[PDB]
Amino acid sequence: WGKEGHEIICKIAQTRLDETAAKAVKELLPESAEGDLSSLCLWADRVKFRYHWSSPLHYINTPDACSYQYNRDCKDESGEKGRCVAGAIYNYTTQLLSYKSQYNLTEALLFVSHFMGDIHQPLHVSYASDKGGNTIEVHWYTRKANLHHIWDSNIIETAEADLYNSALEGMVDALKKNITTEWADQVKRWETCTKTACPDIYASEGIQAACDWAYKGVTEGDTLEDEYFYSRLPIVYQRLAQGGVRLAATLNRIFG
Ligand SMILES: *[C@@H]1O[C@H](CO)[C@@H](O[C@@H]2O[C@H](CO)[C@@H](O[C@@H]3O[C@H](CO[C@H]4O[C@H](CO)[C@@H](O)[C@H](O)[C@@H]4O)[C@@H](O)[C@H](O[C@H]4O[C@H](CO)[C@@H](O)[C@H](O)[C@@H]4O)[C@@H]3O)[C@H](O)[C@H]2NC(C)=O)[C@H](O)[C@H]1NC(C)=O
Ligand SMILES: *[C@@H]1O[C@H](CO)[C@@H](O[C@@H]2O[C@H](CO)[C@@H](O)[C@H](O)[C@H]2NC(C)=O)[C@H](O)[C@H]1NC(C)=O
Ligand SMILES: *[C@@H]1O[C@H](CO)[C@@H](O[C@@H]2O[C@H](CO)[C@@H](O)[C@H](O)[C@H]2NC(C)=O)[C@H](O)[C@H]1NC(C)=O
Ligand SMILES: [Zn+2]
Ligand SMILES: [Zn+2]
Ligand SMILES: [Zn+2]
């Protein structure tokens, strides 16, 4: 996701942390953050070339099909296994199990926070043939955009201005509201994991949603407007709340 999506995810996550996780996160966050996880949840997007080895870790590429398998899909352009957003979540959550060696646990926190968000972007788990939709040029109303960008940013941004009078906390408060009184049963399931993180579950969901909702109906050159916006906004919200809930659930498990 772009900036809004990651904020929303990390804000939600942070208000769902139990006391020990809440403590850990403050201790790992720099003073410049001022205790706010969401201030640094885009940090990973700023180090793709600083740490060139990190850039495959933001997504998963699948063949032209609506499935994800770890052993098949989790790998970078060198074919190196586990070099994908799923493998990264396993790596960085494992490191945070060490919190009380070789690893910067402030980075692991910032990577895990970001990647938990990214694994929930449907187009961060989608076709390598169109690079997760980046090569599908459409218009977002009057502006040229690619399909990937529409899911990273445009949909959230449009809802932000059109249904929440330019206040993001408007939308955060509404996702939070639906977490406790519409989605309560779903949320319990979203939080369940029998490992420390359950990334392949989230990836499988994402590829399903890329196909059912993101790619669906869309042809190169289309103008996506109200109809697409309104029918796809519910899955965007779904995926933000899920990221939010699973990020918190994961840090609670790790630090507990
Ligand atoms: C799990 O999380 C960790 C922590 O973030 C990640 O660890 C990094 O992994 C990358 C590679 O995937 C490492 O980058 C490589 O570093 C090599 C030398 O590193 C030295 O320097 C570092 C810090 O300066 C020290 O750890 C130590 O002194 C090392 O000796 C370079 O030689 C590599 O570059 C060469 O190979 C690459 C291919 O990887 C080529 O592209 C280049 O052209 C070049 O020839 C490379 O840069 C990085 O240093 C690791 N850091 C640490 C702290 O361990 C894991 O990647 C991550 N895994 C996941 C998410 O799956
Ligand atoms: C652990 O990693 C973090 C982030 O990479 C380091 O914090 C950064 O330090 C650099 C270099 O001095 C600064 O320029 C940045 O402003 C800092 N960023 C953040 C987000 O805090 C931290 O110093 C590292 N810990 C080490 C090396 O022990
Ligand atoms: C929170 O959940 C509510 C209710 O399930 C969603 O509101 C419904 O959604 C449609 C748009 O898809 C509206 O036209 C209906 O009028 C709504 N019903 C009610 C009772 O309000 C709402 O959009 C969800 N909000 C978020 C942020 O997820
Ligand atoms: Zn993102
Ligand atoms: Zn993206
Ligand atoms: Zn990213």
Numbering used by the authors: 1 to 100, 107 to 201, 203 to 263
What's written in the study?
We obtained a ligand-free AtBFN2 structure, as well as a phosphate co-crystal structure in a new unit cell with space group P1. In addition to our improved AtBFN2•SO4 co-crystal structure, we were also able to obtain a new, ligand-free, structure, which was solved from crystals belonging to space-group P 1. In this structure, we found that four water molecules coordinate the tri-metallic cluster. Finally, water four (Wat4) coordinates Zn1. Wat1 is in the predicted required position for an activated nucleophile, further strengthening our earlier proposal for a reaction mechanism.
AtBFN2 (also called ENDO2) is a 34.5 kDa glycoprotein (the predicted mass for protein component alone is 30.5 kDa), encoded by the Arabidopsis thaliana At1g68290 gene. AtBFN2 follows the standard glycosylation pattern of plant S1/P1 endonucleases, with three glycosylation sites (Asn91, Asn110, and Asn184). While the P1 nuclease has a higher specificity for RNA over ssDNA, in a previous study we showed that the opposite is true for AtBFN2. Structurally, Zn2+-dependent endonucleases present a unique fold, and are classified into the P1/S1 nuclease family (pfam ID PF02265), itself part of the Phospholipase C (PLC)/P1 nuclease superfamily (pfam ID CL0368).
